[PDB]
Amino acid sequence: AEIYNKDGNKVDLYGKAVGLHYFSKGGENSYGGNGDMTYARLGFKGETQINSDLTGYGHWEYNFQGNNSEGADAQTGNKTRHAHAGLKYADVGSFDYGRNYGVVYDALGYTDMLPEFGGDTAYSDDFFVGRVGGVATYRNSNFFGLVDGLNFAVQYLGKNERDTARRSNGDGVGGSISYEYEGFGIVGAYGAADRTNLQEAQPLGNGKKAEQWATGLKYDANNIYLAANYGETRNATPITNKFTNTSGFANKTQDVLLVAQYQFDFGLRPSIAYTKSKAKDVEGIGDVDLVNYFEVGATYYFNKNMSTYVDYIINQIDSDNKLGVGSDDTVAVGIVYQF
């Protein structure tokens, strides 16, 4: 909701409240857990007309969790998701710096359209696949105006040496190219980065360099949404050995994402998706599957502000999973207000 629009400066303050609950059995071995998952979000998107050819913009977004008590754990789960400012200039393109999605997410976010879950490979603080701190991203749209619907981007990932091996990264560079023609859109993205010595000093994952590339195809027209993603990572997908409490990254993963959705004119939006990410040559185990499930979901939009949804995950992970990944199903039911 727009709050100020004078001097060619618009500031849209937005947010939402999501009453959410996950249902599972026992949910220690659940895919997505069990219990109250209510949360809220707040943010703003500002845009200012510097001149005829230049425009400045800033974006912030925060996630306040609502499933926590008012005592010791009240702060659990709260996170800054977006924090970046930049300039959009003429037909040259755009540059921004701060916390933002990696360029691999340009192609990876194609199948991240599921009501509650989906995009399991878009980890936060995982180089290029998800939201990361300190990324300079140059994005050019319509290739300088000469070639319509043909966009690309290049990103410089800065060294983020956090105390955690999982949330750390080194210096990197990535890019993506997309092409959106008559309903369709096909994307390729790639990124490489140095690994921190803490990352390298881990039992799982061997290498002095991380790689993430992903390709995507989507159809978005005539009330149909259909997407497909394929990605491979090298020492860049976080894993955890449940049996030995061992962290680290998978030496290699092959990731497949599918989504098919039709939005009814009266509100109901059923969803069919599939997700399978299998690791290869993990230390002590070899090949394992990180995620494998079929999703059946539906969202009912009353209007643009209010909606409810159900998201059913039919977990195809087996109870023989060597990494101790959960094998049980998870059903998510939510009611969402947003502005």
**Measured from the CB of residue 237, what is the shortest distance to a second copy in angstroms?**
16
**Contact set for a second copy, span 217-236 (CB under 8 A):** none
**Residue 39 within binding range of a second copy, rule CB under 8 A:** yes
**Residue 50 within binding range of a second copy, rule CB under 8 A:** yes
**Residue 17 within binding range of a second copy, rule CB under 8 A:** yes
The C-alpha torsion from 190 through 192 and 198 to 201, rounded to 10°, is: 90
| Whole-angstrom distance, CA of residue 19 vs CA of residue 36 | 8
- Tell me the DSSP string of 20-89: EEEE-----SBSS--EE--EEEEEEEEEEE-SSSEEEEEEEEEEEESSS-SSTTTTTT-EEEEEEEEEEE
Residue 302: both structure tokens together: 């009353």
**Residue 99 within binding range of Zn ion, rule CB under 5 A:** no
Selected binder of Zn ion within 31, 39, 82, 212 (CB under 5 A): 82
| Whole-angstrom distance, CA of residue 37 vs CA of residue 22 | 7
**Measured from the CB of residue 118, what is the shortest distance to a second copy in angstroms?**
17
**Contact set for a second copy, span 285-324 (CB under 8 A):** 302-306
**Measured from the CB of residue 67, what is the shortest distance to a second copy in angstroms?**
5
**Residue 247 within binding range of a second copy, rule CB under 8 A:** no
Selected binder of a second copy within 144, 181, 243, 339 (CB under 8 A): 339
| Whole-angstrom distance, CA of residue 334 vs CA of residue 330 | 13
Q: By CB neighbour count within 10 A (0-12 exposed, 13-18 middle, 19+ buried), where does 266 fall?
A: exposed
**Residue 72 within binding range of a second copy, rule CB under 8 A:** yes
Selected binder of a second copy within 113, 210, 332, 336 (CB under 8 A): 336
| Whole-angstrom distance, CA of residue 208 vs CA of residue 220 | 39
**Residue 88 within binding range of Zn ion, rule CB under 5 A:** no
Selected binder of Zn ion within 22, 59, 121, 325 (CB under 5 A): 59
- Cross-strand pairs, 36: 21
What one-character DSSP code corresponds to residue 303? S
**Measured from the CB of residue 214, what is the shortest distance to a second copy in angstroms?**
20
Nearer to Zn ion, 82 or 269 (CB): 82
Nearer to a second copy, 118 or 185 (CB): 118
Binding site for Zn ion (CB under 5 A): 59, 82
